[PDB]
């Protein structure tokens, strides 16, 4: 998961580098009950 930081931790605080990764899910290779519904919605009919 390559993420590019945008803020400066001195004023933003810590956490940005590991943002968006849920300890109980992404970090444990587990998915929530409706997550796939979101990904399925990226389908682009032509």
């Amino acid at each position: 998961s390559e993420y590019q930081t945008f803020f400066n931790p001195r004023t933003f605080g810590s956490g940005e580098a590991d943002c968006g990764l849920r300890p109980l899910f992404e970090k444990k290779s587990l998915e929530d009950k409706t997550e796939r519904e979101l990904l399925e919605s990226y389908i682009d009919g032509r």
């Binding site: 933003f12 940005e16 943002c19 968006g20 979101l38």
Partner: protein, 252 residues
């Protein structure tokens, strides 16, 4: 959240509950973006007509909550506000345009399985994910219907709607700082945010890096979950410039 479902434990580690001290009651939703910064809607903090004109001491920021009412000791953490920052161009006396506000915590919060910050979108991710049909997720402890509350955090996935269609769904003036989402009646599914959910995040999972990005902030609507109507959210990315200004000047 109307027509949603119970969230799973740790499903939204960035969800924040703005709790009023007097009287003791849920005020609005919000989100964690770092260990010291919280994002929410301006009208939650400032909008006198709806009994909203809060100072930093008037409320508590509660992070890592699941239950709406139970003081979840050992899980949730109560942080105190050092300063509230409302967008300078937000004017409640006129509209809910630029409905956004930053809250700096006195002390950094400690992350955990239940407390973790959400990502803010970059140019590419914003243009790429904010497209009609694409579904985002909304969470909050607000009302279950227009007209009564949930025991635990509610969650619902809603599709982004094409601007023109949003513009036609209401007589109310719409700006570029907002976007709308929700199912159309013929789509056969329901769901929407409602009173109490404001300030909460509208998140999307990036198919590029598997991370969750906050694309919007629950802001307003006309009633809740009405056919033909859509919920409106503050366009987080279009205000990212202001977010950076505030964090740079007052970061420390």
């Amino acid at each position: 959240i109307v027509e949603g479902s119970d969230a799973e434990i740790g499903m939204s580690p960035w969800q924040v509950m703005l709790f009023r001290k007097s009287p003791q009651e849920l005020l609005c939703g919000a989100s964690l973006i770092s260990d010291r910064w919280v994002l929410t809607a301006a009208h939650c903090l400032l909008y006198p007509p709806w009994d909203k004109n809060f100072t930093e001491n008037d409320l508590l920021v509660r992070i890592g909550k699941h239950s709406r009412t139970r003081y979840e000791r050992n899980i949730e953490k109560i942080s105190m506000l050092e300063k509230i920052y409302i967008h300078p161009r937000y004017n409640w006396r006129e509209n809910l345009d630029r409905d956004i506000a930053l809250m700096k915590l006195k002390k950094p919060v400690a992350f955990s399985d239940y407390i973790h910050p959400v990502c803010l979108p970059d140019r590419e991710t914003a243009a790429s994910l904010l497209q009609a049909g694409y579904k985002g997720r909304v969470t909050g402890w607000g009302n279950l219907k227009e007209t009564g509350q949930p025991s635990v955090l509610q969650v619902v996935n809603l599709p982004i709607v094409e601007r023109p269609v949003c513009k036609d769904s209401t007589r109310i003036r719409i700006t570029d700082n907002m976007f709308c989402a929700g199912y159309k009646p013929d789509e056969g599914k329901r769901g929407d945010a409602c009173e109490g959910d404001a300030g909460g995040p509208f998140v999307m999972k990036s198919p590029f890096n598997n991370r969750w990005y906050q694309m919007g902030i629950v802001s307003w609507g006309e009633g809740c979950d009405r056919d033909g109507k859509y919920g409106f959210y503050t366009h987080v990315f279009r205000l990212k410039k202001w977010i950076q200004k505030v964090i740079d000047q007052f970061g420390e």
